[PDB]
Design a protein around this ligand. Structure first.
Ligand SMILES: Nc1ncnc2c1ncn2[C@@H]1O[C@H](CSCC[C@H](N)C(=O)O)[C@@H](O)[C@H]1O
Ligand SMILES: CCCCCCCCCCCCCCCC[N+](C)(C)C
Length: 285
């Protein structure tokens, strides 16, 4: 109400078709950087490793209520429930993800409380014990960053903790100063992504996040980069989508197929050269 969630911008991507995303994401449908804890893990094992890495920093205890901001297709929520025995609330602006997670909730045999809402954090006003947000922060926009942290710090308990996992990047007009190549290919890359893949998307800077967090009552006790892991994650995603080209075009179109391949491979290369990063910020209240 005070802040209208950007449903259209987010749904433009995530509500394309579950069957389409199923063509390149691992079984859990985790759509974020995996963690190859061991160099020989499969994409699936690596995604669970990333979920445990994030959830393991929140000091979870049975009965707690965990808030997942930008729950995607629900893998993180359901593992928090099954593995850590905490109640959960997931927020998403995607209709298909909400509907999908609602089915996981309907068929769950676990006794804990699980809720999924087709709503943004902008509309969530319930006290929670801990918060986890992986890959959603990039959709908030520069004009919501402060509002987001203020809300998170408010809803959390006295000794609350939020694990914010988000992509971060260097400004093109800075990579050029240090004498690094392809500063133009990078700027052009970012434009393509924000206009054809993630409308309204914004690339956060580590200093930016650090600033908004501290300025809102949080103490970032740790920053962990998984940069190299994303290049790998993206290469596995593009490898899968390519072998599924036929199903991709059939379910969608050659236009969508070609566009997503450019997106996936392009991102992988930008992580490979290190112009974009991904970090988990442990935010202590
Ligand atoms: N303002 C907002 N409030 C709630 N969810 C939001 C949001 N802006 C973006 N999101 C959600 O953030 C997610 C980005 S995709 C990441 C999904 C999941 N966390 C995973 O790691 O697999 C989507 O589910 C999108 O709907
Ligand atoms: C894998 C995505 C890499 C994006 C690199 C930088 C380009 C644009 C700036 C970011 C804005 C949108 C980010 C959306 C991230 C979505 N996922 C969590 C689903 C990957």
């Amino acid at each position: 109400d005070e802040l209208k969630p950007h449903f259209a911008n987010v749904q433009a991507h995530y509500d394309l078709s579950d069957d389409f995303f199923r063509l390149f994401l691992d079984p859990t449908q985790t759509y974020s950087c995996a963690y190859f804890e061991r160099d020989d893990m499969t994409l699936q094992e690596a995604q669970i490793a990333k979920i445990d890495l994030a959830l393991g920093k929140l000091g979870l205890q049975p009965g707690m209520t965990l808030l997942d901001v930008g729950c995607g297709w629900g893998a993180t929520m359901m593992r928090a429930v099954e593995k850590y025995d905490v109640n959960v609330v997931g927020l998403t602006l995607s209709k298909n993800q909400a509907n999908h997670v609602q089915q996981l909730v309907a068929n769950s045999e676990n006794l804990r409380s699980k809720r999924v809402l087709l709503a943004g954090w902008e509309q969530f006003d319930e006290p929670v014990d801990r918060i986890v947000s992986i890959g959603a922060f990039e959709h908030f926009g520069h004009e919501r960053y402060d509002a987001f942290f203020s809300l998170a710090h408010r809803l959390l308990p006295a000794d609350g903790v939020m694990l914010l996992h988000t992509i971060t990047g260097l400004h093109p007009k800075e990579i050029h100063e240090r004498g690094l190549p392809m500063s133009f290919t990078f700027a052009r890359f970012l434009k393509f992504i924000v206009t054809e893949i993630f409308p309204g998307g914004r690339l956060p800077s580590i200093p930016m996040v650090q600033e908004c967090a501290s300025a809102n009552g949080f103490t970032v006790t740790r920053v962990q980069s998984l940069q190299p892991h994303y290049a790998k994650t993206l290469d596995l995603w593009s490898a899968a989508l390519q072998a599924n080209k036929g199903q991709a075009i059939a379910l969608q179109s050659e236009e969508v197929y070609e566009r997503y391949m450019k997106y996936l491979t392009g991102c992988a290369e930008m992580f490979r050269i290190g112009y974009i990063d991904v970090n988990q910020f442990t935010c202590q209240k």
